[PDB]
């Protein structure tokens, strides 16, 4: 999950409480981790009419 808000306190894990056979576990962090990405090559754009 990226660019979103952070949890006010500690990490909160949200889940369903009926059965343990669940589809999604959502982990909401209280601190962000920065990720840096790049595509290092340089492309020329062309155009075909």
């Amino acid at each position: 999950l990226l660019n979103g808000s952070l949890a006010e306190g500690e990490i909160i894990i949200r889940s369903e409480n009926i059965t343990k056979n669940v589809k999604t576990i959502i982990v909401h962090l209280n601190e962000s981790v920065k990720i840096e990405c790049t595509r290092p090559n340089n492309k020329t754009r062309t155009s075909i009419r």
Partner: antibody
Amino acid sequence: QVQLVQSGAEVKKPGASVKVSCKASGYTFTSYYMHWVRQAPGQGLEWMGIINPSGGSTSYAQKFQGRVTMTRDTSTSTVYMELSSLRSEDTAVYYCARDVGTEGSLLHFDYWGQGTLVTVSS
Amino acid sequence: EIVMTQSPATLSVSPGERATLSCRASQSVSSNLAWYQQKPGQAPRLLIYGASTRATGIPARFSGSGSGTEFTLTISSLQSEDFAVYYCQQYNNWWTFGQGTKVEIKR
């Protein structure tokens, strides 16, 4: 009009592979999970695995881990199961069924296919 | 691993009498038990879900009650068409089934 359709299968030699499948309709294919189960005459029921046709990923019981694989095709509304390294221990009737729940967790179901046989013999 | 068993393996019922079967678990599966009916030669159908709720299409003669580690199924006025193999299933953890029991006609 929810229906499940299965093909039959032959008797294979030990070490051989088999492919079985199930087609289903009356409900959007990508909106639900599908299960495969196994039972042999004189035995009880076992769960083999689950496939999510929406994407997608699979999960299997450790019992068949490394021997069972599953795929899906959303253009035909079908799921496929394949078993490698067949042994006489796998002689059984295989079933395919639709799961229940879109809400966040899964429970269980009432739409079952007919049952297809796979046998293994020398 | 959720361990489920059933008793009696075979029940003998005089048609027209009510019949009972029960299931036991080694763990707590209290939020979600279910029962299924298997016809010889045909795919099974769901009868009870949510521990005690009747599945849609199931006649009032089919009922049951329980929670936790124990549950009993009852069929009022068991009819000849109701002699079948019955199974218990747990939804509180990775799905498993019990061995199953069968009801035979008393003669």
